[PDB]
Design an enzyme around this catalytic site. Structure first.
Site, short mmCIF file in Angstrom:
data_model
loop_
_atom_site.label_atom_id
_atom_site.label_comp_id
_atom_site.label_asym_id
_atom_site.label_seq_id
_atom_site.Cartn_x
_atom_site.Cartn_y
_atom_site.Cartn_z
N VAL A 269 14.64 5.21 -5.11
CA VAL A 269 13.51 5.03 -4.20
C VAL A 269 13.30 3.56 -3.87
O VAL A 269 13.73 2.67 -4.61
CB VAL A 269 12.20 5.58 -4.79
CG1 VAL A 269 12.30 7.07 -5.02
CG2 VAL A 269 11.86 4.84 -6.10
N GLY A 270 12.61 3.29 -2.77
CA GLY A 270 12.22 1.93 -2.47
C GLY A 270 12.87 1.38 -1.22
O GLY A 270 13.68 2.05 -0.57
N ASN A 271 12.47 0.15 -0.90
CA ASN A 271 12.94 -0.58 0.26
C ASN A 271 14.41 -0.28 0.60
O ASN A 271 14.74 0.19 1.69
CB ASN A 271 12.71 -2.09 0.00
CG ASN A 271 12.87 -2.94 1.25
OD1 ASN A 271 12.61 -2.50 2.37
ND2 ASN A 271 13.31 -4.19 1.05
N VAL A 272 15.30 -0.54 -0.37
CA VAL A 272 16.74 -0.47 -0.13
C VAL A 272 17.26 0.95 0.08
O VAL A 272 17.97 1.24 1.05
CB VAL A 272 17.51 -1.14 -1.28
CG1 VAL A 272 18.98 -1.17 -0.97
CG2 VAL A 272 17.00 -2.56 -1.49
N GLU A 293 18.07 12.79 -8.07
CA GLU A 293 16.92 13.03 -8.93
C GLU A 293 15.71 13.36 -8.10
O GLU A 293 14.90 14.18 -8.49
CB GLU A 293 16.59 11.79 -9.75
CG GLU A 293 17.52 11.50 -10.89
CD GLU A 293 17.15 10.21 -11.63
OE1 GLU A 293 16.65 9.26 -10.99
OE2 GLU A 293 17.34 10.16 -12.85
N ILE A 363 17.84 -4.86 -11.61
CA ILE A 363 17.22 -6.16 -11.81
C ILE A 363 18.24 -7.26 -11.47
O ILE A 363 18.00 -8.10 -10.60
CB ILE A 363 16.75 -6.35 -13.26
CG1 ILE A 363 15.70 -5.30 -13.63
CG2 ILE A 363 16.23 -7.79 -13.48
CD1 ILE A 363 14.46 -5.31 -12.77
N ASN A 383 10.59 -0.60 -15.42
CA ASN A 383 10.34 0.85 -15.41
C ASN A 383 11.07 1.59 -16.52
O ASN A 383 10.44 2.14 -17.43
CB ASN A 383 10.71 1.44 -14.06
CG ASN A 383 9.96 0.79 -12.92
OD1 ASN A 383 8.76 0.53 -13.03
ND2 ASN A 383 10.66 0.51 -11.82
N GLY A 387 17.63 7.83 -14.60
CA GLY A 387 18.87 8.58 -14.46
C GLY A 387 20.04 7.73 -14.02
O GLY A 387 21.13 8.25 -13.76
N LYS A 407 11.80 -12.84 -6.54
CA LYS A 407 10.68 -13.77 -6.70
C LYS A 407 10.73 -14.91 -5.66
O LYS A 407 10.64 -16.10 -6.01
CB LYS A 407 10.66 -14.34 -8.11
CG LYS A 407 10.38 -13.32 -9.18
CD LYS A 407 9.00 -12.72 -8.99
CE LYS A 407 8.71 -11.64 -10.04
NZ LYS A 407 7.29 -11.19 -9.97
#
Ligand code: COA
Ligand code: COA
Ligand code: CL
Ligand code: CL
Ligand code: CL
Ligand code: CL
Lengths: 504, 513
Positions: A269-272, A293, A363, A383, A387, A407
């Site tokens: 999930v997320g932006n990318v 998932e 990360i 987090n 999976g 950052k």
């Protein structure tokens, strides 16, 4: 429309506060809940309030909390605020709970999502005292219809001494039928059964969770929302990443290393991920299949346009707008979606057999392509591994995608050495940043480093990375995976000391 | 008794030297060979000689060498001596080859053993020019009977443009029938087939490798031995490790967490594995089952005594005495052993389904239970990850066993941070050293550290580890997995600088106070 259709079970309806009293200090509690969907809401709130009161009277009141994956403010949030969780597993995204964990106030271990059920049955979490599961409805024969995720709910129901069901009128009744719950032995005592899934759209079971009605100690009628995902769209960094990935897929297809319909797709999930899915929605690949998932906004859209034929997942992860859309067209989407137990959607045997393409965030990676998915500076939990391991190692192609810096540029996502490792070199073949794509297939570490540095690293950090690599090659104890141990973790320490990885 | 029973194929018999000429500079070569068993012997030697000669005259002559796993002096040894390998995968134990790798003279990547076939078919190693496979015999219909291992041989035969077979009269004829080669799609183009193995003794295929006889460019008749490592007799450190493990198994059974017959067992080779197996041979557990990579001396003994009922593996790894014993009783042992393709013996789906117990060695683990299996000081390759990942992650129970120190005590096997990671915390539940056993099931990293430090670490290093942990807890950027980045890798650097991880009392150390 009555949600409890078994008449006899209506006798077990009681208030959340009263239900919460069945949970004792020290109890191991298994709950529904996966990516902010389908977690119990009212009972955890009542448990939290009674926990604070107990603490003030100098009474200990904590639980061990085992879930599908992440929950929401009503559960992780409220229980962490109350300092009511002594142990948590396997995946959290709540900020308060994250702080409890990073302060050492809650013990945490992020098991591979696909493995949680099996470990729970093996007894690693101890004996399960409570199963607290949210439901859309209860059928005439006492079957428990899950809500917006399946997670580990069936295993928790099997294991727990007592069961509490939250029947949530907020959840759409038409969810009934979307789930596929197998009664086979996936995560039980060996020898396990073969899970006969040979295609992503294959159903092998039924629409309900099974539980002995004698174990149901309380039913709580609820009305409360899931934790719904951010609407915000893909920035330019994410689109660049997607663009490189889609070009890559294009090339693999032209070289006959992938079918024109790719292979079953796993994405996060997320932006990318959103950028990737948006890219796939308009891309040259037809008849796509999801074996993942979570079902996210991008998925729904493709199922809508017909670009994606079916999507397998354990959970939903939608924005308010996407939720609205699916609730108005549930009859349509229900024929296109299959929600499975997480120990099935994340089964390595199945993932490998289907030949999934795994696409995951990170990360950071080091120059040799080791991946950190979890621990900033090596010690502060974000987090969890989730999976990502299940999919990365078992996949036909393991892909990691990330902005090359974090950052606002003060952190490089490519580092001399990863401060913590989640996925070893062997489990990562492709890296994509907004700088470009590194194809590492068949390469030695030194050769991986060349690709990652030149293709993926940000121009601000590339010379520094090349300098570290060159001097390491000259001075390292061994030359197979060159390191300078005196400075391998120094960029991280520099960030700790100065707030940036850029030298002065 | 003629070993080549297909008459037509006898026409392809030629000398080792001549066969070696089919291998060109730059060729990718797939060979049989796994834990020093069943690797090609004569052709590699001849290739090495011709390579040296070429080099002396300024001609490049190198190959990419892809195997099942480790080979022997005739192959890895001879080719490395000749500087004839530009790339190697996925597992080596030869010292000369190790030096070429650690000097950067041979490019090396140790893929998970169970994944090698699939990656080869995907094309990661490039196009296969040669398959060079050792055989016990060739059947009347041209089937290739493998020798003391199966490895990746069937995949290499499928992929290679040309095939060279070494028919080795040293290998016992009765090996014929011990192998199980499946024609199913295990490692091919998705969607793959379900591999229907639901028990360790189950055969799903046949006794021969299949190859189109048109691809066979040469057959070489050989007579030469495998690399039978001498028996590593369990020392007191190994027996202590075994004792703690067996007690642990005893306790799991009494708590009903394991059946009295345990579960299918996977073990490695060497001092410690031998101790464990010796321990099992005399222990209270009956009807044991082996589902592993290798059959070692200990296995044979248990199959003999009846303590072990069946053993599945991809390969043999026996001492001379053990090799002698099995060759005199092949008819017996053949009914008790199944040799499988490594992509089947190391299949995660099957390992998880069977619920295997994984028992593996390690270079080191850090206080949080991350495991290094490969890279000393994080940069010098030892052997390779091998199948340890395949088994550790998929197993019912993942166990790591090691002496608590290495190098006569100059190195601690428990460190603040592992210098390289092969197995993440999630893939390691039990650690055993001669100091005791750490059960990490259900524990957070901080809790794993408490267990590893107190149960497994050597008394010489424990106070230092506790001190690092305590200060990390007070100062680490986050407290979930406490680290002091300034000193996390300092024991390793200290070893590099001084030859020992033990501090000099000429300097301040926090644990001394
Ligand atoms: C690794 C992961 C956190 C990256 O998230 P992402 O949404 O893809 O990418 P983002 O850049 O938006 O990352 C978001 C956060 O990570 C932080 N982050 C990312 N890289 C970082 C780095 N190298 N150093 C420090 N922080 C970093 C960002 O600061 C941001 O935190 P914030 O919200 O407090 O500002 C995420 O993919 C994850 O948790 N994976 C674990 C489980 C998984 O992969 N399962 C698969 C299916 S979901
Ligand atoms: C990690 C591994 C090398 C351990 O070896 P072992 O046989 O169990 O025990 P040893 O103590 O004899 O280790 C052998 C070598 O590693 C070295 N070693 C072990 N621990 C070390 C450490 N913490 N630091 C530096 N060197 C170390 C020893 O010096 C020894 O050196 P040598 O070969 O030059 O003589 C070995 O298990 C391995 O290669 N594992 C990967 C493959 C695998 O596990 N497959 C699964 C089933 S076989
Ligand atoms: Cl299966
Ligand atoms: Cl590869
Ligand atoms: Cl399978
Ligand atoms: Cl666990």
């Amino acid at each position: 429309t009555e949600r409890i259709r078994n008449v006899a079970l209506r006798s077990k309806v009681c208030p959340a506060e009263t239900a919460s009293e069945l949970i004792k200090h020290g109890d191991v509690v298994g709950t529904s809940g996966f990516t902010g969907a389908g977690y119990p809401k009212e009972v955890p709130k009542a448990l939290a309030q009674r926990m604070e009161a107990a603490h003030d009277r100098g009474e200990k009141y904590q639980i061990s909390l085992i879930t599908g994956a992440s929950t929401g403010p009503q559960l992780d949030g409220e229980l962490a605020k109350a300092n009511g969780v002594y142990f948590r597993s396997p995946f959290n995204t709540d900020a308060t709970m994250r702080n409890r964990i990073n302060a050492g106030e809650t013990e945490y271990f992020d098991n591979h999502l696909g493995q949680v059920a099996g470990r729970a049955v093996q007894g690693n979490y101890g004996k399960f005292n409570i199963a607290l599961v949210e439901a859309t409805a209860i059928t005439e024969d006492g079957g428990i219809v899950p809500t917006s995720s399946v997670g580990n709910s069936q295993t928790f129901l099997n294991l727990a001494e007592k069961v509490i069901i939250e029947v949530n009128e907020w959840q759409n009744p038409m969810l009934e039928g979307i789930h596929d719950i197998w009664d086979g032995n996936v995560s039980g005592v060996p020898t396990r059964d073969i899970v006969p899934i040979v295609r992503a759209d294959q159903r092998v079971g039924g629409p309900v969770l099974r539980v002995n009605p004698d174990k149901i100690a309380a039913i709580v009628r609820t009305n409360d929302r899931d934790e719904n995902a951010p609407f915000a769209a893909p920035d330019e960094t994410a689109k660049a990443i997607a663009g490189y990935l889609l070009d890559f897929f294009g090339h693999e297809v032209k070289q006959n290393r992938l079918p024109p319909s790719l292979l079953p797709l796993q994405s996060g999930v997320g932006n990318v991920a959103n950028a990737v899915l948006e890219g796939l929605k308009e891309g040259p690949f037809e008849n796509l299949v999801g074996y993942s998932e979570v079902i996210q906004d991008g998925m729904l859209a493709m199922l809508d346009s017909g670009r994606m034929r079916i999507a397998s997942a354990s959970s939903f992860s939608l924005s308010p707008e996407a939720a609205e859309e699916i609730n108005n067209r549930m009859d349509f989407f229900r024929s296109k979606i299959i929600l499975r137990q997480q120990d099935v959607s994340n089964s390595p045997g199945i993932i490998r057999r289907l030949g999934c393409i795994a696409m995951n965030g990170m990360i950071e990676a080091d120059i040799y392509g080791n991946v950190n998915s979890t621990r900033v500076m090596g010690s502060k939990m974000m987090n969890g591994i989730g999976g990502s391991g299940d999919f990365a190692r078992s996949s036909y192609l393991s892909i990691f995608l990330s902005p090359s810096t974090a950052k606002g540029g003060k952190i490089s996502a490519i580092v001399p050495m990863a401060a913590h490792v989640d996925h070893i070199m062997q489990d990562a073949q492709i890296f994509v940043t907004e700088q470009g794509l590194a194809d590492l297939r068949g390469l030695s570490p030194v050769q991986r480093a060349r690709e990652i540095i030149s293709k993926c690293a940000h121009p601000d950090y590339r010379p520094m990375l090349q300098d570290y690599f060159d001097r390491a090659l000259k001075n390292s104890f061994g030359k197979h995976t060159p390191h300078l141990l005196t400075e391998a973790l120094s960029w991280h320490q520099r960030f700790i000391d100065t707030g940036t990885m850029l030298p002065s």
